[PDB]
Amino acid sequence: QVQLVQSGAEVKKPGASVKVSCKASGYSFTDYYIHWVRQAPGQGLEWMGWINPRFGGVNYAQKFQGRVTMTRDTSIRTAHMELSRLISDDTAFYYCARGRFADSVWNLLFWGQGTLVTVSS
Amino acid sequence: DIQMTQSPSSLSASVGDRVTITCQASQGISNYLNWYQQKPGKAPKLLIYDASNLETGVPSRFSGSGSGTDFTFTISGLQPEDIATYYCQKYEFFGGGTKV
Amino acid sequence: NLWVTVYYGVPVWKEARTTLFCASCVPTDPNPQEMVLGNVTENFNMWKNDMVDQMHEDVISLWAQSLKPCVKLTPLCVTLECTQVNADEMKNCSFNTTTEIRDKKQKAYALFYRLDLVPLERENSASKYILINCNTSAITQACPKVNFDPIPIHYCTPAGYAILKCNNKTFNGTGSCNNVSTVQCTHGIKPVVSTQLLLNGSLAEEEIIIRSENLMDNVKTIIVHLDQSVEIVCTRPNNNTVKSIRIGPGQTFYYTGDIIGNIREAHCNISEKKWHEMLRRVSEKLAEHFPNKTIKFTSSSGGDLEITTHSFNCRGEFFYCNTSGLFNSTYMPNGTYMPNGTNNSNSTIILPCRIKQIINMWQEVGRAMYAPPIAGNITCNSNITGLLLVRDGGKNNNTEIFRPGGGDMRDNWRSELYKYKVVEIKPLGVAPTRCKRRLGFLGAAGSTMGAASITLTVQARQLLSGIKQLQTRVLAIEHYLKDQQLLGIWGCSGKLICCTAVPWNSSWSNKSLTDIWDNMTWMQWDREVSNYTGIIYRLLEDSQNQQERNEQDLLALD
Amino acid sequence: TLECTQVNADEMKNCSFNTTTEIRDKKQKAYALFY
Numbered sequence: 108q109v110q111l112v113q114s115g116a117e118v119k120k121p122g123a124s125v126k127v128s129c130k131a132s133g134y135s136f137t138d139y140y141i142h143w144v145r146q147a148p149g150q151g152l153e154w155m156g157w158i159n160p161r162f163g164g165v166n167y168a169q170k171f172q173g174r175v176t177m178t179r180d181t182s183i184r185t186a187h188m189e190l191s192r193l194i195s196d197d198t199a200f201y202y203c204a205r206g207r208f209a210d211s212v213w214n215l216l217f218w219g220q221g222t223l224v225t226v227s228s
Numbered sequence: 229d230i231q232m233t234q235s236p237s238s239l240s241a242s243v244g245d246r247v248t249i250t251c252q253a254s255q256g257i258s259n260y261l262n263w264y265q266q267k268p269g270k271a272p273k274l275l276i277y278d279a280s281n282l283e284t285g286v287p288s289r290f291s292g293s294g295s296g297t298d299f300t301f302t303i304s305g306l307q308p309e310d311i312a313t314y315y316c317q318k319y320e321f322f323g324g325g326t327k328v
Numbered sequence: 329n330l331w332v333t334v335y336y337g338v339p340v341w342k343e344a345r346t347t348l349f350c351a352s353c354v355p356t357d358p359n360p361q362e363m364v365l366g367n368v369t370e371n372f373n374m375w376k377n378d379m380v381d382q383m384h385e386d387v388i389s390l391w392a393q394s395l396k397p398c399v400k401l402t403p404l405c406v407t408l409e410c411t412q413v414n415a416d417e418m419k420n421c422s423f424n425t426t427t428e429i430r431d432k433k434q435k436a437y438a439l440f441y442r443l444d445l446v447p448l449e450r451e452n453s454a455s456k457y458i459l460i461n462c463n464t465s466a467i468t469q470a471c472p473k474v475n476f477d478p479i480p481i482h483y484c485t486p487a488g489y490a491i492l493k494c495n496n497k498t499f500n501g502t503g504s505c506n507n508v509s510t511v512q513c514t515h516g517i518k519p520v521v522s523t524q525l526l527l528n529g530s531l532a533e534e535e536i537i538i539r540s541e542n543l544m545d546n547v548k549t550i551i552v553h554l555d556q557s558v559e560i561v562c563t564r565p566n567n568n569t570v571k572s573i574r575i576g577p578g579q580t581f582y583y584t585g586d587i588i589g590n591i592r593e594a595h596c597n598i599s600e601k602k603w604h605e606m607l608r609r610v611s612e613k614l615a616e617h618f619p620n621k622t623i624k625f626t627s628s629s630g631g632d633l634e635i636t637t638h639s640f641n642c643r644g645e646f647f648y649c650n651t652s653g654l655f656n657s658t659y660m661p662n663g664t665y666m667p668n669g670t671n672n673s674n675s676t677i678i679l680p681c682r683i684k685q686i687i688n689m690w691q692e693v694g695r696a697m698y699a700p701p702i703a704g705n706i707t708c709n710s711n712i713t714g715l716l717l718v719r720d721g722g723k724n725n726n727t728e729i730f731r732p733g734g735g736d737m738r739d740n741w742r743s744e745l746y747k748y749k750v751v752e753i754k755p756l757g758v759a760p761t762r763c764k765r766r767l768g769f770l771g772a773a774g775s776t777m778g779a780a781s782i783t784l785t786v787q788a789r790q791l792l793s794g795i796k797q798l799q800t801r802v803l804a805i806e807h808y809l810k811d812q813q814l815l816g817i818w819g820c821s822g823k824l825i826c827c828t829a830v831p832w833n834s835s836w837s838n839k840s841l842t843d844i845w846d847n848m849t850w851m852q853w854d855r856e857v858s859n860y861t862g863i864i865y866r867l868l869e870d871s872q873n874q875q876e877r878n879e880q881d882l883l884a885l886d
Numbered sequence: 887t888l889e890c891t892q893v894n895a896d897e898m899k900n901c902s903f904n905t906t907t908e909i910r911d912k913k914q915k916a917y918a919l920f921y
C-alpha cells in the first residue's frame with residue numbers, strides 16, 4: 108500500500124522558518140516526483156513546487172523562489188521542505204502528493220495528510 | 229501563466245439532479261485536465277485522470293469530457309456522499325473550485 | 329470482377345521495438361547505404377523512442393561490465409586521521425590498511441578532496457573521517473585500462489527491421505517528417521556524459537532548434553540544439569605526484585601522494601563573446617515559442633552537485649563547474665539583451681570547477697566509483713553543442729526563467745537519436761486485381777502500388793531468412809516462417825505475386841483499379857484495408873482447403 | 887562464539903556476541919534472542 112505520512116501541525120512567528128517532512132512508504136522512492144501543494148484555508152490550492160528525489164532536482168514556482176527550499180533523504184525515504192520568511196499570509200495546509208505514473212506526474216492520485224502551519228504574532 | 233477559470237463558484241442541487249461544472253483554460257492544445265474531489269478535512273481525491281479517462285475506485289456516476297480550452301465535468305445524479313468542493317487542474321495550475 | 333491477389337515483399341512497415349545491436353561489438357561496413365524515400369512522410373516522436381532506452385541500458389551495462397574485474401576498496405573503509413594540506417579543498421589523511429600478506433598491516437598517507445570525505449566527529453590537529461558512502465556500499469576503483477574517452481557507437485538493425493532517418497533540417501523531434509531516408513546503421517554516436525551542457529554532439533544544420541515534449545509544462549526537459557558550437561577548455565593546473573600501495577593479493581590502490589608547486593583551483597574558460605552570442609540567439613529562438621514574455625537565464629535553484637554544477641569527465645577526472653556567470657541574462661520582447669557590451673569583448677568567463685573522486689555512479693546508490701588520480705596536469709577541450717534547460721512553473725509577470733537542468737542521462741541521448749525511428753517490415757499483403765486462379769530496401773515505399781509490385785525480390789531478400797541478439801535472430805526466423813506458412817496454407821508457396829480465387833468484396837474497398845494501382849502507395853493501402861485482414865486470410869485458407877479437396881477428388885477420377 | 891544465558895528477564899537464549907561493524911577497523915557488541 109502506497110502511503111505518505113507528513114509531520115504534525117506547527118506554530119511559528121513571522122520571520123521564522125518551518126521544516127515539513129513527508130515520509131514515503133510502499134514504492135521505490137528514487138523513481139517518482141513528489142509535489143508539495145499548499146492549500147490556503149479557503150482560497151484554493153497553490154502548487155508551489157516539485158522535487159525529483161533521483162538527483163534532488165527542484166522546480167520552485169516563480170512566486171515561492173528564494174523562500175522554499177526542498178531536499179530529500181533517501182536513506183530513510185523522506186522528503187523535506189523548508190519555507191523561510193514566514194508571513195501571516197502563509198497559513199495553509201501543506202500537502203505532499205505524487206503522480207500515479209512516473210511518465211505523467213500531474214495525476215496526483217496519492218496524497219498524504221495535511222500539515223497545518225499557522226503564522227501569527 | 230495558464231489561468232484556470234472555473235464556474236459556477238457555488239452550485240445548489242439536491243439528490244438526483246444532474247450537476248454540470250465547467251473549467252476554461254487560458255491555453256490548451258492538449259487534453260490534460262484533472263478533476264479533484266476534496267472533502268472537508270481530507271486531502272483531494274483524483275477522479276478524472278486525463279481529460280476524460282476515469283480513475284479506479286470511483287463509481288461510474290462521475291464523468292466528463294472536452295478538449296482544448298473548454299472542458300466539462302458532470303455527475304449523473306448527485307448522491308448524498310458527493311458533497312465536496314470540485315477543482316480542475318492543468319499541469320501546475322489549479323482552478324478556484326466549485327462547492328457542490 | 330476483382331479478386332484477391334497476395335503479394336509478398338511489399339514496402340510496408342509498422343512501428344515496433346527490437347534489440348538493435350551496437351557495431352563499433354561487430355565491425356561496421358563501408359557506408360550506411362542510405363536509400364532516400366521519395367514522397368514518404370512519417371511521424372516521429374523523439375520522446376517515445378526505444379533506441380534511447382536501449383542505449384541507456386547498453387551504457388549502464390558496458391560501464392558496469394568494466395568495473396567488475398577491478399579492485400574493490402573494501403579495506404579502505406577505515407577511520408582516517410586527516411589534517412589540512414599545509415605542507416578545506418583537500419585533506420592529508422593517514423590510515424592503517426591491510427597489506428598483501430594476510431597477517432600484517434600498512435600505514436599510508438593520501439591526499440583526498442574534502443568532497444570525498446565525511447566526518448565521524450565534530451570537524452575542527454587531525455579529525456576523523458571515512459570515505460564518502462563507504463559505510464553504505466562498496467567503492468570500486470577503476471582499473472587503469474578503463475577507457476574514459478567515449479567511443480562512437482553505431483546501432484545497426486536486425487534482420488526484418490529498418491531505421492527511418494529524418495532529413496528535414498528544421499525538424500524539432502516530434503511530428504510529421506518528410507524527406508525520410510532508410511538506413512541500415514546510425515552514425516557514430518559518442519556516449520558523452522555531461523550535465524547542463526551537451527558536449528561533443530552534432531550541430532543543427534540550419535539554426536537553433538528548441539525541442540521539448542511539451543513547451544507548456546515545467547517538468548519536461550528543454551533541449552537546445554545549437555547550430556554553431558561554443559568552445560570550452562577545462563584544466564586541472566595542479567602538478568600531482570601519484571603514489572600507490574597494495575591492499576591485497578594483486579590489488580593496487582592509486583592515490584595522490586603529494587602536489588608539486590602551489591595549489592591552484594581547476595577551472596574552465598569560455599569566451600565571453602561566443603557564449604553571450606549563443607545565449608542571445610537561444611533567447612531569440614525561445615521568444616518564438618513564448619511570445620511577449622521576458623526570457624531570463626539563471627542558475628539552478630537546488631539539487632545535488634551532479635545537477636547544480638556542470639558535471640563532465642575530463643581525461644578521467646570528474647569536474648563540476650559552477651556555471652552561474654554563464655546563465656545570468658535577461659532578454660525582453662524589445663530585442664535588447666540586458667548584459668550588453670559582450671559583442672566587442674575580449675574577456676573570458678572563468679568557471680571554478682571542483683574535482684571529486686568517489687563518484688556516485690549514475691544513481692544506482694549501491695555502487696560508487698573511485699577515479700584514480702593522474703600524475704601531472706590535465707587539459708581538455710570540447711565543443712558545447714547544446715543546452716539542457718528547465719522552465720520555472722507557477723504564476724509569473726509574463727517572465728520565463730529557464731534554469732539549467734540534467735541528471736537524467738536519457739535527455740543527453742535524445743539529442744543525437746532524435747532523427748531515427750525503428751520500424752518492422754510487413755512484406756505480406758493483399759490487393760484487388762483482375763487475376764483469377766485457374767534498387768534498395770523500401771525504395772518503392774513512396775511509389776504507387778503498380779510501380780512497387782516490380783521491386784519485390786529486393787525487399788524479400790533483405791529479410792535475411794548474446795541473448796539480446798540471439799533472441800532477435802530467432803524472432804526474425806519465427807516471423808519469416810509464419811509468413812511462409814501463411815503463403816503455403818493459401819496455396820501461394822514459392823510465389824511473390826500469387827493470384828487467388830477469393831472475390832473482392834466491395835465493402836473492403838470500393839476504389840477502382842486506376843484509383844489503387846496507379847494512385848495509391850502500399851502504406852496508404854495498408855492503412856485502408858487493415859480492419860479486414862482477419863476476414864481475407866480466413867477466406868484464403870478456406871478457398872485453399874476447398875481447392876485441395878477438389879484436387880484430390882479430380883486426381884482420384886480414373 | 888556466542889555467550890548465551892537463559893531468557894529470564896530452554897526454548898530461547900539471550901546471546902551476546904562481538905561482531906564486525908560497517909567500518910572495517912572497529913567491532914560491535916550486540917545481544918539477540920535466538921531459539
Ligand SMILES: *[C@@H]1O[C@H](CO)[C@@H](O[C@@H]2O[C@H](CO)[C@@H](O[C@@H]3O[C@H](CO)[C@@H](O)[C@H](O)[C@@H]3O)[C@H](O)[C@H]2NC(C)=O)[C@H](O)[C@H]1NC(C)=O
Pocket residue numbers: 477478520521522527528640641642643644707708709710711
Ligand atoms: C570531447 O572531445 C575532445 C576531443 O575528442 C576530448 O578531448 C580529448 O580527449 C582525449 C582523451 O582524454 C585526449 O587524448 C589524450 O591525450 C593525452 C595527452 O596527450 C594522452 O595521454 C591520452 O592517452 C589521450 O590520447 C585529447 O588530447 C583531448 N583533446 C583535446 C583537444 O584536448 C574531450 O575530452 C571530449 N569531451 C568529453 C566531455 O568527453
Ligand SMILES: *[C@@H]1O[C@H](CO)[C@@H](O[C@@H]2O[C@H](CO)[C@@H](O)[C@H](O)[C@H]2NC(C)=O)[C@H](O)[C@H]1NC(C)=O
Pocket residue numbers: 412413414415420422437439585586587
Ligand atoms: C601528509 O602527512 C604526512 C604525515 O602524515 C607527511 O609525511 C611526513 O612529512 C614530513 C615532512 O617533514 C617527513 O619528515 C615525514 O617523514 C613524513 N612522514 C611519512 C610517514 O612519510 C606528508 O609530507 C604530508 N604531505 C602533505 C602534502 O601535506
Ligand SMILES: *[C@@H]1O[C@H](CO)[C@@H](O[C@@H]2O[C@H](CO)[C@@H](O)[C@H](O)[C@H]2NC(C)=O)[C@H](O)[C@H]1NC(C)=O
Pocket residue numbers: 182446447448463464
Ligand atoms: C555512514 O557514516 C556517516 C559518518 O559517520 C554517517 O553520517 C552520520 O550519521 C549519524 C547517525 O546518527 C548522524 O548523527 C551524523 O550527523 C552523520 N554525519 C554526517 C557528517 O552526515 C552515516 O549515517 C552512515 N551511514 C549509515 C547508513 O548509517
Ligand SMILES: *[C@@H]1O[C@H](CO)[C@@H](O[C@@H]2O[C@H](CO)[C@@H](O)[C@H](O)[C@H]2NC(C)=O)[C@H](O)[C@H]1NC(C)=O
Pocket residue numbers: 892893894895900902917919
Ligand atoms: C539480554 O541480555 C542483555 C545483557 O547481555 C540484557 O541487556 C541489559 O539489561 C539490563 C536490564 O537491567 C540493563 O541494565 C543493561 O544495561 C542491558 N545491557 C545492554 C548491553 O543493553 C537484556 O535485557 C537481556 N534481555 C532479555 C530479553 O533477557
Ligand SMILES: *[C@@H]1O[C@H](CO)[C@@H](O)[C@H](O)[C@H]1NC(C)=O
Pocket residue numbers: 407408409422423424
Ligand atoms: C595505526 O595503528 C596504531 C597502533 O598503535 C595507532 O596508534 C594509530 O593511530 C593508527 N593509525 C591511524 C591513522 O588511525
Ligand SMILES: *[C@@H]1O[C@H](CO)[C@@H](O)[C@H](O)[C@H]1NC(C)=O
Pocket residue numbers: 496497498499506507
Ligand atoms: C520541415 O518541416 C517543416 C514543418 O513546418 C516544414 O515547413 C519544412 O518545409 C520542412 N522542411 C523540409 C526541407 O522539408
Ligand SMILES: *[C@@H]1O[C@H](CO)[C@@H](O)[C@H](O)[C@H]1NC(C)=O
Pocket residue numbers: 500501502503504538539540541542543
Ligand atoms: C514540433 O514540431 C511539430 C510539427 O508538427 C509541432 O506540431 C510541435 O508543436 C513542435 N513542438 C515544439 C516543442 O516545437
Ligand SMILES: *[C@@H]1O[C@H](CO)[C@@H](O)[C@H](O)[C@H]1NC(C)=O
Pocket residue numbers: 364495496507509
Ligand atoms: C533529403 O535528404 C537528402 C539526404 O541526402 C538530401 O540530399 C536532399 O536534398 C533532401 N531533400 C530535401 C527536399 O530536403
Ligand SMILES: *[C@@H]1O[C@H](CO)[C@@H](O)[C@H](O)[C@H]1NC(C)=O
Pocket residue numbers: 561562563595596597676678707
Ligand atoms: C583561462 O583564462 C585565464 C585568464 O587569466 C588564464 O590564466 C588561464 O590559463 C586560462 N585557462 C585555460 C585552460 O586556457
Ligand SMILES: *[C@@H]1O[C@H](CO)[C@@H](O)[C@H](O)[C@H]1NC(C)=O
Pocket residue numbers: 636637650652
Ligand atoms: C557558485 O558560486 C556562487 C558564488 O556566489 C555561489 O553562491 C553558488 O552557490 C555556487 N554554485 C554552486 C552550484 O556551487
Ligand SMILES: *[C@@H]1O[C@H](CO)[C@@H](O)[C@H](O)[C@H]1NC(C)=O
Pocket residue numbers: 567588704705
Ligand atoms: C611536476 O614536477 C616534476 C618535478 O619538478 C616535473 O618533472 C614535472 O614535469 C612537473 N609536471 C608538470 C605537469 O608541471
Ligand SMILES: *[C@@H]1O[C@H](CO)[C@@H](O)[C@H](O)[C@H]1NC(C)=O
Pocket residue numbers: 528557709710711
Ligand atoms: C569543435 O568543432 C570544430 C568545428 O570546426 C572542430 O574543428 C574542432 O576540432 C572541435 N573541437 C573538439 C575539441 O572536438
Ligand SMILES: *[C@@H]1O[C@H](CO)[C@@H](O)[C@H](O)[C@H]1NC(C)=O
Pocket residue numbers: 365366367774775776
Ligand atoms: C515522387 O513524386 C513525384 C511527383 O512529381 C514523382 O515525379 C516521383 O517519381 C516520385 N518519386 C518516387 C520515388 O515515387
Ligand SMILES: *[C@@H]1O[C@H](CO)[C@@H](O)[C@H](O)[C@H]1NC(C)=O
Pocket residue numbers: 887888889902903904
Ligand atoms: C567481546 O570482547 C571482549 C574483549 O575484552 C571480551 O571480554 C568479551 O568477552 C567479548 N564478548 C563476547 C560475547 O565474547
